[PDB]
Design a protein around this nucleic acid. Structure first.
Lengths: 80, 123, 199, 78
RNA sequence: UCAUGGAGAGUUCGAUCCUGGCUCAGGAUGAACGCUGGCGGCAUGCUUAACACAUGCAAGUCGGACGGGAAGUGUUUCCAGUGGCGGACGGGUGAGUAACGCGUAAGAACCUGCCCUUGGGAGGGGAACAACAGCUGGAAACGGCUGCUAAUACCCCGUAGGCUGAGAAGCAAAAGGAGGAAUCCGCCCGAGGAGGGGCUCGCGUCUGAUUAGCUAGUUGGUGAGGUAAUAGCUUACCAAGGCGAUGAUCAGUAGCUGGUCCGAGAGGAUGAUCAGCCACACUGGGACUGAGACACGGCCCAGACUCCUACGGGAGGCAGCAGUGGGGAAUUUUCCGCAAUGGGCGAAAGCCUGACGGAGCAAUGCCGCGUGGAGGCAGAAGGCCCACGGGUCGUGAACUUCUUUUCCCGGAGAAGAAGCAAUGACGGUAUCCGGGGAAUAAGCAUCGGCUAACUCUGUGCCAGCAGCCGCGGUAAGACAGAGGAUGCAAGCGUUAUCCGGAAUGAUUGGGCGUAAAGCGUCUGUAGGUGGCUUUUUAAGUCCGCCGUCAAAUCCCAGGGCUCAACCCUGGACAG
């Protein structure tokens, strides 16, 4: 399926990452149905948009490694 | 030309900005091969002996190009680098030759405006 | 660049550039030839309002095109907003607070990293200040009292209403963006604005 | 979407009608309302359309290369 | 309130008004060349020959599917082979393609391994094929008999909410592995969904009439086949249709679009990097497997070309990254790393990624910064010019102090890396602290009008300049030099391409008595526009709501890099 994954969105030596739920066959910087999330590893926030991640994980788009690790920081996981 | 039907057929179109250099036809300046280095005269109001090199180009044309500056090294079968720009006085000369570039030396002893003639700094 | 050059030339040509590069008036031993006789084209007049502006703030002219594009880009009197984006320039403020005698003095005084702003150092003269800022010295400048020399010889002219100079704790802050009346230099905004219409 | 109502041109083919469809369109650079006609092949197993009647085209499964519509009847609210 | 936008000038003539053309002032380049050249941040880097390509690398993985063997001496690491997925993604180029290829908007006739949800099932047998051993052919590339072997590999029987058929009837499947177990990964048959594809259609999609007819599987219909699915997709027969002067057919050009640039605006030109879709992979043509290709680094054939050969034969596709050669005015390093991110495989460990993350060179561009700050008797040395009085270079320098962005010499020193720890190519980079020291750092155009800047010496229709007008035949504000000035600034100029100016293709916005221009006049087809009142539908029109026009860009407002460039978050008018 769809695989919720980051994409690099920034300058050189910056690493401002989006969390996009695109199809896994696409290149890493493509297009999404809905670009759900944010991750700034230098130091800043991470907007998550919980209902849409629950929509796609409720559908069954498995995430990658560190997207899943961000999803294990917060308490997003509910099986409903 | 009404808005109805003499003009939703077409008005007409202007052609282009017509090319002011029919050679150089890619882009700005192009390597040349000297064929003649003769000297012709301008039209009636002026009076000079302007020294032009009729030059074959790498494009596929052959064209008579002007040689600027005072001194010139250009003998038969040397290599130059022509550029655009119309010398008015000479009928047929459409182009210039860059000085200081390949096998066409800079002008002798010039100390005012050297970048147009390819002469490095003195002093 | 800086232009770093002969400068009474520019004062004789452009008229007296106020404060910038001199408090001394020009031609103390000079001007005894060269009748203008009254012929000056209008393009020379608008050009002399360019360089009356450009030398008085020490800008690169390409950067002045940049400030005009931002000045058009903002909403309002572009003739005034150009003299808001060139008053809240940092070394113009350090000139205006008397932290340096001249504007090359303030530009060099901020190149060698002697200014903290809100407690953080700013190494660049083209920094644009904001309302409610904080402009101080360096911690070594209570041991390096160059700023105190400038504040010693300065206080003939006081301050315009954005500034607030604290005497010994050396802090100057701007309450709000400077008003046109507030702008120190005397020139016509329309003349300069019209000149850049062509681009 | 909409149907495409229009006159029947010529029905000398079984289950098949050509249909003129008249469509107003704003010409792009000059702002009038130019008509463009475009004629289609529609399907009818009933083939109950003579020359000159006017039908409404609705999209269906493609029947041949050109025959990609079947036309039934307009509403007729005058 | 809205408004954030619109400049002229030269040249026809003894002069004037006007038409009209040319030329310039403004931006932008993926740019090129010349002169000059300190640093930093972020981008960009064959536009030409889709032209050949040396060398290395660019796609693997799984021993927890299976059999063997080969290092290590119960224990583990490997391995060619059979299998499983991945090689259809990612990367590159724009030759073709004027067409549902693209863009946008609807639709029904379909498929879909991996991915979630869900209903049921896995008994019984059996034959080999690699590997391997032997013989043997070849320089190699590869083989060829003889035997033998295992499985999630193949075959058969039974069983099936599936299929065929009107029913009658029949038909169809399985695979084990890991673990002590627990259980987990699987497998087979179904049923949905998401995503991905395959089709169809409305509308938009370059020029040329000095290209006017085209089309016979052509356009329909049926029957037979065929496709995952509709279909002249294909075939036999019947019908004569179908397209076109609103440009068919032919010829030529061109990847397309979010966008970029310009413009006041309407819109004009254009499609590099960024991103989505298409097509190609030496030139052609085929098919095979799989879910999915007619497959860049797969197979087979033909053609051309290069290499090897022991002369019989083999091998090959850089428009992957670096690189060489040619062409060109012109476009870089045969670099480091999987640390992140994203892929592929695996139960995990991990492995592989020239994608990507970085680094190097180049002022190729955009932005920021410096080459000193303050004082400097108004006295001297000098250049140039002068009615020889002087002026101007010039506070400029010299000279006195202050400072160290940068520079040199030392110390420290990151985050980026993800809560088990460890895990960094970048790199001892960024940044900070200390010690000297004005030290290490300004050029290039122009100065007749547009167009800011001017005098002097030399030249004498010569040398030359020139964007247009035109200067140059002895005192040239136009050539050459000096001085001075101007504008710019690590850039400055020339050229080329595009838009503006240009209302010089005109809807906004032009004209036709004489300036370029009314057919010689008339009839009339197509087509265009059209009197008044009343009524009806609403196609146009207008208003509300809703869906969509990807993300990035532009606009507004915040936020982050010391600011800016750039990056990021949110929002939206238009249309």
């Amino acid at each position: 399926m769809v695989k919720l994954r980051l994409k690099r969105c920034g300058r050189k030596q910056r690493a401002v990452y989006r969390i996009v739920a695109i199809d896994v066959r696409s290149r890493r910087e493509g297009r999404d149905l809905q670009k759900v999330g944010f991750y700034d590893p230098i130091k800043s926030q991470t907007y998550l948009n919980v209902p849409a991640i629950l929509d796609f994980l409720e559908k069954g788009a498995q995430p990658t490694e560190t997207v899943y690790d961000i999803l294990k920081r917060a308490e997003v996981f509910k099986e409903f | 030309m009404p808005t109805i039907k003499q003009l939703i057929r077409n008005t007409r179109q202007p052609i282009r900005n017509v090319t002011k250099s029919p050679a150089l036809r890619g882009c700005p300046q192009r390597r040349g091969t000297c064929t003649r280095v003769y000297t012709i005269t301008p039209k009636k109001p002026n009076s000079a002996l302007r020294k032009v090199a009729r030059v074959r180009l790498t494009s596929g044309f052959e064209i008579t190009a002007y040689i600027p500056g005072i001194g010139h090294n250009l003998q038969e079968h040397s290599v130059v680098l022509v550029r655009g720009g119309r010398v008015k006085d000479l009928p047929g000369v459409r182009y210039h030759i860059v000085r200081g570039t390949l096998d066409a030396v800079g002008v002798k002893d010039r100390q005012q405006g050297r970048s147009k003639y390819g002469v490095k700094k003195p002093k | 660049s800086r232009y770093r050059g002969p400068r009474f030339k520019k004062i004789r040509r452009l008229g007296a550039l106020p404060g910038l590069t001199n408090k001394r008036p020009r031609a103390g031993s000079d001007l005894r030839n060269q009748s203008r006789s009254g012929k000056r084209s209008q393009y020379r007049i608008r050009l002399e309002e360019k360089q009356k502006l450009r030398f008085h703030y020490g800008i690169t002219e390409r950067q002045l095109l940049k400030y005009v594009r931002i000045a058009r880009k903002a909403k309002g009197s572009t003739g005034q907003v150009l003299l808001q984006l060139l008053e809240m320039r940092l070394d113009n403020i350090l000139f205006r607070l008397g932290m340096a005698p001249t504007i090359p003095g303030a530009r060099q005084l901020v190149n060698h990293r002697h200014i903290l702003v809100n407690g953080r150092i700013v190494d660049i003269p083209s920094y644009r200040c904001k309302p409610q800022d904080t402009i101080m010295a360096r911690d070594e400048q209570k041991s390096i009292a160059l700023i105190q020399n400038s504040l010693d010889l300065s206080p003939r002219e006081e301050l315009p209403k954005h500034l607030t100079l604290n005497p010994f704790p050396y802090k100057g802050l701007v309450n709000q963006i400077i008003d046109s009346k507030w702008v120190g230099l005397k020139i016509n905004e329309l003349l300069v604005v019209e000149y850049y219409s062509r681009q | 979407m909409r149907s495409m109502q229009g006159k029947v041109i010529c029905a000398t083919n079984d289950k098949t009608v050509n249909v003129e469809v008249v469509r107003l369109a704003p010409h792009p650079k000059y702002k009038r309302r130019v008509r463009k006609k475009k004629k289609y092949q529609a399907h009818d197993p009933d083939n109950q359309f003579k020359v000159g009647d006017w039908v409404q085209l609705d999209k269906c499964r493609p029947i041949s290369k050109t025959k990609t519509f079947l036309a039934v009847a307009p509403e007729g609210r005058q």
